[PDB]
């Protein structure tokens, strides 16, 4: 939370307490809590993360695995010609 919001890192160990700057860009990738129930239960807490991290992150993608056929064939020729 401190890294992502104040853009600073304060290290206070027994040697010397200091304060510096890091304004990094961060990308994370997590799974749902259990299984593929990403839209089934409730939109809230499918992750079981702290509440402040929701407002800390900018975009939250929810990716399904929707099964169809046009899509199925296109995935097939993409990965298949990918191997060649």
């Amino acid at each position: 939370h401190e890294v992502m919001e104040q853009q600073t890192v304060t290290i206070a160990k027994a040697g010397i307490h200091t304060t510096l700057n890091a304004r990094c860009s961060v990308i994370a990738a997590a799974n749902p809590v259990f299984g593929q129930y990403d839209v089934n239960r409730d939109p809230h807490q499918n992750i079981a993360l702290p509440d402040s991290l929701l407002s800390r992150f900018d975009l939250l993608f929810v990716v399904t695995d929707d099964i169809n056929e046009i899509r199925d064939r296109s995935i097939s020729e993409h990965v298949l010609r990918t191997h060649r």
Partner: protein
């Protein structure tokens, strides 16, 4: 002499025959229908609007092909067609086919139409 004749087997890979030689075997029964389709297959290649098996069209969902296969039937209204890669229900709903020799079941024919996997019913334009 029918009882004393030879035996030659077709190979789709080499497109040639081999030196083959009481009751027969099951493997023979299976390879029976396979040999007819492959002989007809080579006959189609000699007559040069393409060739594609049934699983490829059911593998797709949109369209448009003149499929080759055996007019069998499994259930009521369930007129199936069969090649060595799958089955597909065929329909003749409002079809004006040609004035063929004799369209009969148990015959390898050619029918044009679309798959339309929504109802999963292949349609026929004309039986030839």
């Amino acid at each position: 002499n029918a009882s004393q004749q030879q035996r030659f087997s077709y190979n789709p890979h080499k497109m040639q025959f081999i030196f083959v030689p009481f009751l027969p075997d099951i493997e023979d029964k299976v390879q029976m229908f396979l040999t007819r389709y492959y002989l007809t297959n080579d006959r189609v290649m000699r007559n040069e609007n393409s060739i594609t098996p049934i699983k490829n069209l059911l593998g797709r969902d949109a369209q448009n092909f003149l499929l080759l296969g055996l007019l069998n039937k499994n259930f009521k209204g369930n007129w199936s067609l069969e090649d060595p890669s799958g089955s597909v229900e065929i329909d003749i709903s409002q079809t004006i086919p040609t004035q063929g020799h004799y369209y009969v079941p148990g015959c390898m024919v050619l029918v044009e139409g679309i798959y339309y996997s929504v109802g999963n019913k292949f349609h026929v334009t004309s039986m030839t």
